[PDB]
Design a protein around this ligand. Structure first.
Ligand SMILES: OC[C@H]1O[C@H](OC[C@H]2O[C@H](O[C@@H]3[C@@H](O)[C@@H](O)O[C@H](CO[C@H]4O[C@H](CO)[C@@H](O)[C@H](O)[C@H]4O)[C@H]3O)[C@H](O)[C@@H](O)[C@@H]2O)[C@H](O)[C@@H](O)[C@@H]1O
Ligand SMILES: OC[C@H]1O[C@H](OC[C@H]2O[C@H](O[C@H]3[C@H](O)[C@@H](O)[C@@H](O)O[C@@H]3CO)[C@H](O)[C@@H](O)[C@@H]2O)[C@H](O)[C@@H](O)[C@@H]1O
Ligand SMILES: OC[C@H]1O[C@H](OC[C@H]2O[C@H](O)[C@H](O)[C@@H](O)[C@@H]2O)[C@H](O)[C@@H](O)[C@@H]1O
Ligand SMILES: OC[C@H]1O[C@H](OC[C@H]2O[C@H](O)[C@H](O)[C@@H](O)[C@@H]2O)[C@H](O)[C@@H](O)[C@@H]1O
Ligand SMILES: OC[C@H]1O[C@H](O[C@H]2[C@H](O)[C@@H](O)[C@@H](O)O[C@@H]2CO)[C@H](O)[C@@H](O)[C@@H]1O
Ligand SMILES: [Mg+2]
Ligand SMILES: [Mg+2]
Ligand SMILES: [Mg+2]
Ligand SMILES: [Mg+2]
Ligand SMILES: [Mg+2]
Length: 1059
């Protein structure tokens, strides 16, 4: 009773339907097979193909039995091979015993082959664009390649194979040197060297440094055509040295450096095994090379980036097209001031990140199992009882699970013709008796709530009045996409929401309707945005959208049309509304948060999540989240939960979530449930430490969020984004930069406590304890399960919201309308400046500058007008005085006195931080710390040999001192920076020698001297001896030894380097 063949199937990249044509788009010399099905299985069935070649009727092709399966027979018809330009049209047919024939088709394909640019025959400079007139290696086209400047450092190439299209205008600030053999195009930032015969482009910086170039054999640039009807693909090919690293490509789970891979720009919903399958929800045809350029292929069609995956020194892109011969290839080679500036330039092209409200940057709580008011009340109560000041709240299991815009258990008179509901239309029952009151109680807790959504109208063949009404309206209005035959497009039956009808987000009227149905959720229920899931749901080549585009072009674009439509809609009603989504392509960054999707509770998954965040970052998707510790699989171990917590608190968006809808016991990845499930009570204080730390750093984090929106600098960055020339930074995927100043190194390996941290050149200070670490090597950091290595860069100015306790990890709550103690942590190093985004006070930028002058025992802070009292925490030795506007401020002897003071200073001996309180003033204030040196290098943080630490004599700095240190083969080794370059310095050695005069031997980069340490009154008396040393650039190895000619026990507190 039937026959079926459909040449492209669902056009899936990864799989085929069993009734497709192979190849889908035949090239010259390729054997063409047609897979055909008939049903039911019967003897005496014939299957054949009726067809024409170049309009000429051919002898029928008889199909061969392939296999039987289920109710069906599958057959193969072999059409043979074809030549470039052949136009084949066929109809597949089946009948039983000479009866009624069932057929599919007709279907046409045009047989293609590659044509490439040969030579540049002439150059036409039009002032805002340059045309290169070209010959082709085959065919009769007259190609034109157009060059323009999006900016003086960003080159755009537009290729028209037929020469019938014209490129776009760019900047005029270029000069041209056109010669017989070569044309050179120059700006203040770029030198574009184009050989004419054969055509070959090299892109150089203006100083001559090569950025990238086309492949050396040339004929690199080409298009796939029958020469008459279709252009089906484009390619270009580039030369790449062995060491070149390639970053970005959207959100990638397998690796941060794609060298060696064929990367598919193809959005896909892959559950749990994204790394293994090399798939992603969020695919962007943009990469950044550590050779200091980006490349962006400007098209929504699928592309494949072959990154030294075929030939060791070649990278290529192959870009699909729908056949339209008027669609130019359009790509950019992007330079800039640095790697982050390359990202900024990319965002000039594809869209800036939209700044989200500060609440988006606190903790988000989520669990699929929350499905009733009492679950929401319990979540709020549990958060409150456990001192968890979260700011975001997600509900997934909230709706009727039919319309997805009506609360579960709500009753109402159904509405026809897609008419919208108001709040008053509903009687609220059962699980949700008062959604408005429920939302109000979330707001009372200082949280903001988002509701889960999909872009599809569900249709599983069940009867459900409202859903049925909406479907009839949607179809009659043409608010769906079209399947290509005049019927609404439905998601393929085997997929998530199979048989459902996608809303055509290209259709403004459709969007207005769809969103109107949700209006009451925003205006009356008072929600704060949507979790817009899915979107990877466009299949089929003939699927047609209101914009005239079809399924090949729209698959990658659809999720971003969907996500952006909802984001803009929610914001139009509630300016503080935030979206939380997983899928998209270039431009996704304009529309809210992206999370890394569906992963298991394992360390392998944690590793893949971090790769996903780092690649997304390079791709301009900065507001990135993950389900901390995984949302499914066996419940995370306490170790994984703690490791994930620490990293999550230092990532752009912090969010816990769980998959299961009605589990027993609870699957919540909340800290209180983690305690319950693992039995490890210490999870709670560890979680609190990290969450409170994040809240302490929220002024810094939110300023970084604004810097993303303004300047294209992502919040969390792979090391080579800041240090592209650093050979050790190239492949690192277990540490990153967070904001401008913090190097974060999470432990993402099971059982690991010795964490390698690569430190780039410069000085890095442990933010938790003041340990100093000279850059330019990989250090080993001991991190137990509760510990996260985080370091501040030299010169850092870090705004913080602190309690009167003034330590990191102390709860300041979630009231985002005020600070407790606004604080700036400062690591003085030369002259540094910072622009603080003061969201509490109308979004004023506060420009702070620090002038480090340790050589003259001074640090100066230029504080602008502020609306709040401010506390500086300056990393330094103890001042002899502090002035504000020249006037001495009072030394506070205790933290209590400091807190009570209007202005003053206090010295934290454990952290080596000077606190300075300045009153709120509507004028600039000049703060000077006098008598200060670079903070001490604590002996207890040194590399120790046969020697231990103690704290049983008062008055030390840091956490203690090295004790006794009085036998041969005992050593204390320091890694010491020069304060102001290679020079002689004075090294202060602070020690106690309670019994008798002591001596120790010191080696400074291998150069030995002996030092005399006179007796102190007793072991509770410290003294300082000044030792002349010569220090060079970089890390200076300073070794204190007890050798054979040394004498007596000492307690060794610290060293200070001064003029
Ligand atoms: O950024 C500075 C350091 O921060 C962390 O340590 C802070 C603590 O440092 C001291 O004591 C620690 C030890 O008790 C031990 O358990 O862990 C680490 C390092 O272990 C080993 O390091 C050296 C070899 O590389 C050896 O010299 C040493 O004998 C080994 O035990 C120690 O740092 C203080 O005494 C504590 O008060 C302080 O809290 C971080 O762990 C460390 O790696 C950083 O360098
Ligand atoms: O009650 C609403 C809804 O709950 C579940 O879906 C919520 C989750 O949706 C996403 O994950 C789904 C995948 O997209 C599917 O392809 C498939 O693998 O199943 C998962 C469910 O885990 C999302 O990424 C998750 O964060 C959400 O928890 C049910 O699956 C739906 O049927 C319900 O309508
Ligand atoms: O739109 C369908 C239906 O929704 C509401 O009632 C919810 C309803 O769901 C199923 O149809 C069950 O059979 C009922 O027991 C539930 O109450 C509207 O009140 C109703 O008018 C409408 O048909
Ligand atoms: O040479 C003096 C002294 O050195 C060592 O003891 C150092 C030790 O002395 C007291 O116990 C203090 O309380 C500690 O803080 C010091 O580290 C030798 O052990 C000792 O024999 C000698 O007299
Ligand atoms: O209507 C198009 C549809 O045809 C085929 O489905 C058949 C199936 O193979 C038979 O066993 C029987 O159940 O009837 C169906 C037609 O209703 C294709 O297999 C299917 O992919 C296609 O959509
Ligand atoms: Mg720029
Ligand atoms: Mg529940
Ligand atoms: Mg606050
Ligand atoms: Mg305050
Ligand atoms: Mg000390």
């Amino acid at each position: 009773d039937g026959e079926y063949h459909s040449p492209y199937g669902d056009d899936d990249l990864y799989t085929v339907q069993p009734t497709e044509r192979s190849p889908r788009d035949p090239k010259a010399g390729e054997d063409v097979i047609l897979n055909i099905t008939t049903w039911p299985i019967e003897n005496g069935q014939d299957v054949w193909v009726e067809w024409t070649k170049n309009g000429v009727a051919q002898e029928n092709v008889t199909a061969a039995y392939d296999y039987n399966s289920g109710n069906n027979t599958y057959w193969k018809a072999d059409l043979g091979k074809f030549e470039k330009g052949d136009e084949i049209t066929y109809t597949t047919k089946g009948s039983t015993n000479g009866g009624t024939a069932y057929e599919s088709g007709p279907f046409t394909f045009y047989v293609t082959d590659w044509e490439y640019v040969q030579d540049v025959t002439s150059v036409v400079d039009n002032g805002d664009s340059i045309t290169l007139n070209m010959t082709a290696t085959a065919g009769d086209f007259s190609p034109k390649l157009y060059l323009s400047f999006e900016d003086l450092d960003t080159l755009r190439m537009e290729l028209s194979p037929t020469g019938k299209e014209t490129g776009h205008a760019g900047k005029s600030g270029y000069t041209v040197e056109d010669t017989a053999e070569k044309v050179t195009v120059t700006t203040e930032d770029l030198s574009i060297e184009i050989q004419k015969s054969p055509y070959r482009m090299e892109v150089h910086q203006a100083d001559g440094t090569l950025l990238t170039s086309e492949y050396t054999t040339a004929n690199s640039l080409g298009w796939l055509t029958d020469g008459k009807n279709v252009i089906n693909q484009y390619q270009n090919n580039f030369m790449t040295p062995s060491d070149e690293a390639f970053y970005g490509f959207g959100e990638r789970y397998d690796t941060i450096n794609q060298r060696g891979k064929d990367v598919e720009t193809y959005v896909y919903n892959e559950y749990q095994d994204q790394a293994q399958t090399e798939r992603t929800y969020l695919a962007v045809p943009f990469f950044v090379s550590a050779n200091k350029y980006g490349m962006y292929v400007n098209s929504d069609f699928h592309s494949q980036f072959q990154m030294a995956s075929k030939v060791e020194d070649k990278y290529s892109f192959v870009l699909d097209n729908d056949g339209d011969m008027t669609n130019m290839l359009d790509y950019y080679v992007i330079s800039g001031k640095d790697q982050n500036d390359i990202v900024n330039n990319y965002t000039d092209i594809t869209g800036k990140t939209t700044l989200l409200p500060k609440w988006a940057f606190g903790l988000w709580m989520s669990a699929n199992e929350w499905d009733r008011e009492s679950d929401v009340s319990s979540a709020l109560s549990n958060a409150k009882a456990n001192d968890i000041p979260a700011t975001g709240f997600v509900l997934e299991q909230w709706s009727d699970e039919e319309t997805y815009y009506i609360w579960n258990n709500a009753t109402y008179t159904a509405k026809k013709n897609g008419e919208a509901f108001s709040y008053d239309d509903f009687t609220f029952n059962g699980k949700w008796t008062d959604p408005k009151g429920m939302v109000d109680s979330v707001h009372d807790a200082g949280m903001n709530i988002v509701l889960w959504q999909v872009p599809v109208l569900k249709d599983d063949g069940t009867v459900y009045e409202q859903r049925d009404n909406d479907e009839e309206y949607m179809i009659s209005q043409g608010y769906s996409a079209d399947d290509g035959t005049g019927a609404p497009y439905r998601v393929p039956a085997s997929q998530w929401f199979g048989n459902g009808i996608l809303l055509d987000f290209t259709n403004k009227d459709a969007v207005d309707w769809w969103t109107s149905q949700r209006e009451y959720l925003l205006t009356e229920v008072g929600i704060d945005g949507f979790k817009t899931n899915g979107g990877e749901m466009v299949w089929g080549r003939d699927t047609t959208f209101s914009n005239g585009e079809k399924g090949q072009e729209m698959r990658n674009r659809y999720p971003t049309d969907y996500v952006s439509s909802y984001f803009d809609f929610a914001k139009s009603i509630n300016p503080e509304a935030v979206s939380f989504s997983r899928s998209g392509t270039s431009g996704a960054q304009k529309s809210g948060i992206y999370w890394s999707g569906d992963q298991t509770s394992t360390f392998d998954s944690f590793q893949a999540s971090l790769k996903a965040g780092l690649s997304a970052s390079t791709s301009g998707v900065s507001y990135w989240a993950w389900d901390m510790a995984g949302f499914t699989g066996d419940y995370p171990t306490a170790e994984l939960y703690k490791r994930a917590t620490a990293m999550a608190a230092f990532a752009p968006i912090m969010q816990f979530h769980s998959e299961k809808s009605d589990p027993s016991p609870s699957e919540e990845r909340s800290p209180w449930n983690a305690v319950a499930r693992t039995g490890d009570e210490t999870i709670l204080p560890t979680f609190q430490k990290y969450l409170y730390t994040r809240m302490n750093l929220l002024p810094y984090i939110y300023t970084a969020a604004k810097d993303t929106a303004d300047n294209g600098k992502s919040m969390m960055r792979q090391m080579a984004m800041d240090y592209p020339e650093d050979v050790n930074a190239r492949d690192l995927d277990e540490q990153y930069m967070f904001g401008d100043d913090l190097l974060v190194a999470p432990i993402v390996q099971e059982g690991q406590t010795e964490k390698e941290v690569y430190l780039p050149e410069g000085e890095w200070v442990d933010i938790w304890n003041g340990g100093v670490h000279p850059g330019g090597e990989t250090i080993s950091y001991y991190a137990d399960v509760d510990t996260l290595p985080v370091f501040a860069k030299a010169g850092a100015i870090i705004p913080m919201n602190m309690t009167d306790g003034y330590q990191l990890g102390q709860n300041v709550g979630n009231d985002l309308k005020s600070y407790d103690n606004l604080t700036f942590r400062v690591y003085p190093s030369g002259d540094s400046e910072y622009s603080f985004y003061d969201d509490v006070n109308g979004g004023e930028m506060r420009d702070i500058s620090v002038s480090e002058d340790f050589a003259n025992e001074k640090v100066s802070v230029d504080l602008p007008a502020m609306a709040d009292e401010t506390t500086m925490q300056v990393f330094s030795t103890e001042p002899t005085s502090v002035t504000i506007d020249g006037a001495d401020v009072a030394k506070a002897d205790t933290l209590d006195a400091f807190n009570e003071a209007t202005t003053g200073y206090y010295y934290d001996t454990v952290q080596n931080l000077t606190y300075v309180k300045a009153a709120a003033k509507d004028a600039k204030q000049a703060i000077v710390l006098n008598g200060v040196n670079h903070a001490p290098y604590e002996a207890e943080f040194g590399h120790l040999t046969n020697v231990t630490t103690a704290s049983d004599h008062a008055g030390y700095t840091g956490t203690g001192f090295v004790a006794g240190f009085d036998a041969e083969k005992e050593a204390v080794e320091f890694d010491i920076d020069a304060v102001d370059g290679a020079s002689d310095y004075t090294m202060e050695v602070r020690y106690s020698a309670g019994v008798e005069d002591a001596t120790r031997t010191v080696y400074i980069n291998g150069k030995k001297q002996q030092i005399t340490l006179p007796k102190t009154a007793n072991w509770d008396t410290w003294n300082t001896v000044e030792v002349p040393v010569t220090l060079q650039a970089g890390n200076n190895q300073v070794v204190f030894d007890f050798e054979a000619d040394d004498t007596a026990g000492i307690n060794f507190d610290h060293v200070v380097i001064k003029k």
